[PDB]
């Protein structure tokens, strides 16, 4: 694995030697099976918006 | 003492007032045809692979 660039909010390592199917479950991992917290309801006592 | 009829008259004039044609010049349009889309000059990609 080599690291080109790391800022806050990015990386670009390289990952040589895996197959797709493996770099596809790592892609398909972050995108849609990492945990976050996220407002999910909502409370309105005025809205004169 | 009355009116009688005269000779008939051995002509006719009709008088109509009428101006004339000038040059033919044909001037299409002010900026004429359908000028066409183009190039912004030298543009540059807005856009990176990433590594």
Same mark, same amino acid.
């Given at each position: 694995?080599?690291?080109?660039?790391?800022?806050? =909010?990015?990386?670009?390592?390289?990952?040589?030697?895996?197959?797709?199917?493996?770099? =596809?479950?790592?892609?398909?991992?972050?995108?849609?099976?990492?945990?976050?917290?996220?407002?999910?309801?909502?409370?309105?006592?005025? =809205?004169?918006? | 003492?009355?009116?009688?009829?005269?000779?008939?008259?051995? !002509?006719?004039? $009709?008088?109509?007032?009428?101006?004339?044609?000038?040059?033919? !010049?044909?001037?299409?349009?002010?900026?004429?045809?359908?000028?066409?889309?183009?190039?912004?000059? !030298?543009? $540059?990609? $807005? &856009?990176?692979? &990433? !590594?």
């Amino acid at each position: 694995v080599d690291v080109v660039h790391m800022d806050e =909010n990015s990386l670009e390592f390289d990952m040589v030697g895996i197959d797709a199917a493996i770099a =596809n479950a790592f892609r398909r991992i972050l995108l849609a099976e990492v945990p976050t917290m996220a407002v999910e309801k909502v409370l309105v006592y005025n =809205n004169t918006s | 003492g009355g009116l009688t009829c005269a000779s008939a008259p051995q !002509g006719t004039l $009709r008088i109509l007032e009428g101006p004339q044609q000038s040059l033919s !010049g044909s001037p299409l349009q002010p900026i004429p045809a359908s000028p066409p889309p183009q190039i912004p000059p !030298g543009l $540059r990609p $807005r &856009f990176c692979a &990433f !590594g």
